[PDB]
């Protein structure tokens, strides 16, 4: 088993050392690889080291910028990233093939993966606006309303409805990194139109990195 640590928010151009600690085996008679998955993208191989011989391979996109080393005394593979760019934001998994040369199998054993976000935006806040329904949107007796959480940083943010009382029909869209470097998502619930005048709808937005709690009432503006 492999456990990664050291991932977190770093500014562009900074350096970060992810430590992949290996358990159940010694990294000396092995080869340790790093595979990064950009948010919403496919897997990409980053670097590989064979501590037995000291051979080190890099992807053509990260050659020189990154540097992978190993330490068998602490049984840990360290990937040091220098001159980090904005596209380096990804979840880094510490993979290890069955054999050091893997025979034919491939990266058999994988770590838990740790997130590395390269963005210069400071820890901002959630600004929860209400998206009210209207009579024109009624069809089949259901109308949708919701909340918009915009211009907060960093991820994640938790959006609930009526402190968890309202859970049916709630869709919370994945946060999208805007051109401003700040995240934004929407949580929308579709409720019966006749229930608008009897059920009170409030969205609770909790942003732990900024430690902000915002409770916003959503109602069709009369």
């Amino acid at each position: 088993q492999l456990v990664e640590s050291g991932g977190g928010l770093v500014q562009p151009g900074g350096s970060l050392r992810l430590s992949c600690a290996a358990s159940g085996f010694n990294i000396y008679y092995s080869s340790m690889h790093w595979v990064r998955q950009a948010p919403g993208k496919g897997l990409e191989w980053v670097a590989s080291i064979s501590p037995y011989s000291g051979s080190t391979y890099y992807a053509d996109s990260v050659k020189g910028r990154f540097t992978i080393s190993a330490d068998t005394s602490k049984n840990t593979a360290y990937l040091q990233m220098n001159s980090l760019r904005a596209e380096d934001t990804a979840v880094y998994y510490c993979a290890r093939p069955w054999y050091p040369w893997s025979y034919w199998s491939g990266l058999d054993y994988w770590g838990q993966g740790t997130l590395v976000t390269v963005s210069s935006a400071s820890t901002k806040g959630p600004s929860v606006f209400p998206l009210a329904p209207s009579s024109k949107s009624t069809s089949g007796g259901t109308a949708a309303l919701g909340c918009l959480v915009k211009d907060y940083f960093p991820e994640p943010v938790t959006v609930s409805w009526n402190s968890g009382a309202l859970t049916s029909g709630v869709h919370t869209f994945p946060a999208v990194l805007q051109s401003s470097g700040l995240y934004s998502l929407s949580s929308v619930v579709t409720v019966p139109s006749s229930s608008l005048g009897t059920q009170t709808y409030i969205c609770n937005v909790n942003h732990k990195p900024s430690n902000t709690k915002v409770d916003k009432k959503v109602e069709p503006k009369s």
Binding site: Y52, S55, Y57, P100, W101, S102, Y103
Partner: peptide, 29 residues
């Protein structure tokens, strides 16, 4: 070539250390 001359090196370390029976496997790659 730095990949090829890499895996030989690995196999080399697997032959120097005496693990001939496993070193061969690396050379198979």
């Amino acid at each position: 070539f730095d990949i090829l001359v890499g895996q030989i090196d690995d196999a080399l370390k697997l032959a120097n250390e005496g693990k001939v029976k496993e070193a061969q496997a690396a050379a198979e790659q």
